[PDB]
């Protein structure tokens, strides 16, 4: 517990770095008496308390004093016409490392000795304006405003500003990108305009310290492409990709390893899958159903014959009619009865004409012809 010291003494010895308050019962002027001194009380006087330690604020620490004393240009305490030390009632004052000081009548220690907040590199304090004030540049700050104190540094606490959170940076590895969403309207890290709720990717490798209105969402891994795989994407809206090619909402395309070995799907690219390479050997062929033309549009109803030792990826909307078909290997005794489905080795044929072909021949049918029969022992 420790009992309360006596105040009604003829003598009070005030040691170094201690103080008492004495009330003058005439005039009612309450004042501080500071050590070291042997204070002798007078008839009119009344000691408000026995000696208490002065507040000592050490280096790199602070405290907050409520109802702090008003001071003149030269930092001397100001008094009323009555002689009472005049205070700035109801506001606060941050006190940094300093000569041990007493508390004058009325003023009180609103926050005891606290270390100053050290902000490390790649970290930042998220600071909020509690009310209106002019900062050290002379810029008018408004209540509710938000900004960052980026380290390294030692943040001096401000009565007008609260620390909402310490912000740590997010690390982005080689084949990664960080997805962000704008809390409010703001400018990008690259300087690009961003509306509220809009999302974009940060591709910069390393530690990324986000801006005050950048909401950090998720890291996105790149899809690692190979010789035998392709990434099948779809545009969520109109956008120009990282390579600089225009994509319109709903359009689909393939990213190969020729474009990039690692592709991070951007915010407006929807991944539909990874396409395996169609590998056709020397005696293999296939028929692409609804092949994609030069315009980048599926030719609904058309067919394309692909043959020989060739490899390719099926484009969006393409199909194989009958998979990797074996090429017809016709020996001498073998033969094929063909038919034209439309006009046309050999001479030109008409609509539904039919003719025979013998071996030795390595044969793949045209898109316009069909194999009607496979005769043998001719």
List keywords for this structure.
mainly beta; 4-stranded antiparallel beta sheet; 0% helix; structural protein; monomer; SH3 type barrels; Major vault protein; 378 residues
Query: What's the CATH topology label of the largest domain?
Result: SH3 type barrels
Intertermini distance: 120 Å
Q: What's the CATH architecture of the largest domain?
A: Roll
Main sheet overview: 4 strands, antiparallel
The fraction of residues assigned to DSSP E strands is over 45%
In DSSP terms, counting alpha (H) and pi (I) runs of 4 or more, how many helices? 0
Molecular structure report:
This protein has 378 residues and is mainly β. It has seven domains: 1-54, SH3 type barrels (Roll); 55-116, SH3 type barrels, CATH 2.30.30.560; 117-168, Major Vault Protein repeat (SH3 type barrels, Roll); 169-221, Roll (SH3 type barrels), CATH 2.30.30; 222-276, SH3 type barrels; 277-327, SH3 type barrels, CATH 2.30.30.560; 328-378, SH3 type barrels, CATH 2.30.30. Helices cover 0% and strands 46% of the residues. The chain contains no helices and 41 strands. Strands 2, 3, 5 and 6 form a four-stranded antiparallel sheet that branches. Strands 32, 33, 35 and 36 form a four-stranded antiparallel sheet that branches. A three-stranded antiparallel sheet has the order 8-7-9, with no helix packed on it. It is rod-shaped, with a radius of gyration of 43 Å. The N and C termini lie far apart (120 Å). 11% of the residues are buried.
């Amino acid at each position: 517990g420790p009992l309360g010291m006596a105040t009604e003494e003829a003598i009070i010895r005030i040691p170094p770095y201690h103080y008492i308050h004495v009330l003058d019962q005439n005039s009612n002027v309450s004042r501080v008496e500071v050590g070291p001194k042997t204070y002798i009380r007078q008839d009119n006087e009344r000691v408000l308390f026995a000696p208490v330690r002065m507040v000592t604020v050490p280096p790199r620490h602070y405290c907050i004093v409520a109802n702090p004393v008003s001071r003149d240009a030269q930092s001397s305490v100001l008094f009323d016409v009555t002689g009472q030390v005049r205070l700035r009632h109801a506001d606060q004052e941050i006190r940094l490392a300093q000569d041990p000081f007493p508390l004058y009548p009325g003023e009180l220690l609103e926050k005891d000795i606290t270390p100053l907040q050290v902000v490390l590199p790649n970290t930042a304090l998220h600071l909020k304006a509690l009310l209106d004030f002019e900062d050290k540049n002379g810029d008018k700050v408004m209540a509710g405003d938000e900004w960052l104190f980026e380290g390294p540094g030692t943040y001096i606490p401000q009565k007008e500003v609260e620390v909402v959170e310490i912000i740590q940076a997010t690390v982005i590895k080689q084949n990664q990108a960080l997805r962000l969403r704008a809390r409010k309207e703001c400018f990008d890290r690259d300087g690009k305009e961003r509306v509220t709720g809009e999302e974009w990717l940060v591709r910069s490798v390393g530690a990324y310290l986000p801006a005050v209105f950048e909401e950090v969402l998720d890291l996105v891994d790149a899809v690692i492409l190979t010789e035998k795989t392709a990434l099948h994407l779809r545009a969520r809206q109109n956008f120009k990709d990282l390579r600089g090619v225009a994509h319109r909402t709903g359009e689909e395309w393939l990213v190969t390893v020729q474009d990039t070995e690692a592709h991070v799907p951007d915010v407006y690219e929807e991944v539909l899958g990874v396409v395996p390479i169609t590998t056709l050997g020397p005696r293999h062929y296939c028929v692409i159903l609804d092949p994609m033309g030069p315009d980048g549009k599926n030719q609904l109803g058309q067919k394309r014959v692909v043959k020989g030792e060739k490899s390719f990826f099926l484009q969006p909307g393409e199909r194989l009619e009958r998979g990797i078909q074996d090429v017809y290997v016709l020996s001498e005794q073998q033969g094929l009865l063909l038919k034209a489905l439309q006009p046309l080795e050999r001479v030109a044929h008409q609509a539904g004409d039919r003719w025979l072909i013998r071996g030795p021949l390595e044969y793949v049918p045209s898109a316009k012809v069909e194999v009607v029969e496979e005769r043998q022992a001719i």
